[PDB]
Amino acid sequence: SWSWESYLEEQKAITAPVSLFQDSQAVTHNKNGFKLGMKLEGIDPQHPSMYFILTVAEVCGYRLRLHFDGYSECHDFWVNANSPDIHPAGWFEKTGHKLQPPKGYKEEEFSWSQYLRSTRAQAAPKHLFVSQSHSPPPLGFQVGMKLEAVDRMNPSLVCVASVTDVVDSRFLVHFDNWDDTYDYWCDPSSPYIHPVGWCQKQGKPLTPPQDYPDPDNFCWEKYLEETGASAVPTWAFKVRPPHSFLVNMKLEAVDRRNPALIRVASVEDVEDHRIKIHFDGWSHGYDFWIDADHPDIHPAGWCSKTGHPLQPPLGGGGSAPSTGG
Ligand SMILES: CN(C)CCCC[C@H](N)C(=O)O
């Protein structure tokens, strides 16, 4: 039997304190009421502005694997039961959002009552969730306002962006005149967003809207006038202090190569808002960077307290394939 207590003694190591994580990353006493076969609604992680019909394909501890109805299983993805990116059946119609129907359907063609009959299934109960859009909005951020944001797909770019939607306590960041595949959900403390004018005060180049006429001479004031849009007010931005994870601290993290697994991990390197994860016993070739507030990193003990299997360090110490670290 593997235990953190014994491992720390053996390695003469320390864990990353629970206080370093967000409450949502650390909470272990919540029940996961989702069951295999339950259907629901959710955003496509690779297309944050789109909503699809999803089915619980697997349950493990406080996590569940979701399947896009009608599409290939290669698109399946895992989330935690407290994910704010899934909603109960009927949410889209109740909140006025659009649905991308199951493969083989047209949008006019979808009705939850009929679909459940056709699939002889049941929708996940409303109480099973966390976001159904009854919550406090993000103060100061309204649809239509503009701001500057980092393109997470092209990290060196800070661009002209807009708030295109607000759901409970989060808002959707959209890159002006770029396709919505670049959109991503945020909250007021995100270190990836800044008020209009930030780049100029920092000396950083600002990426104007796609194909903006004479891009070199882009001027926020002129653009705000052309669009009649307001800039998100400066007071609304509540910058988050850099995290306090230190190199070598131990924790638990979802494996990026096989998301069904969670392994014993160590902080390999650090940035102001991200940490580099290294899986104990493994080579460093699989090490990866991840946001400090990412939903897939947790404090030691998360797995055992939630009922999820934890992969112990890989054995072999260099003599076995993929080891050395
Ligand atoms: C700025 N960012 C939001 C989008 C960048 C898109 C780059 C892509 N090669 C293209 O030119 O379409």
From Swiss-Prot:
Post-translation changes: Ubiquitinated in a VCP/p97-dependent way following DNA damage, leading to its removal from DNA damage sites, promoting accessibility of H4K20me2 mark for DNA repair protein TP53BP1, which is then recruited to DNA damage sites.
GO cellular component term of the entry, any: chromatin lock complex
Consequence recorded when altering residue 151 to A: Abolishes binding to monomethylated and dimethylated peptides
Record carries keyword Transcription regulation: yes
Predominant localisation class: nucleus
Mutagenesis / variant outcome for changing residue 68 to A: Does not affect binding to monomethylated and dimethylated peptides
The organism's place on the tree of life at top rank: Eukaryota
Entry protein name: Lethal(3)malignant brain tumor-like protein 1
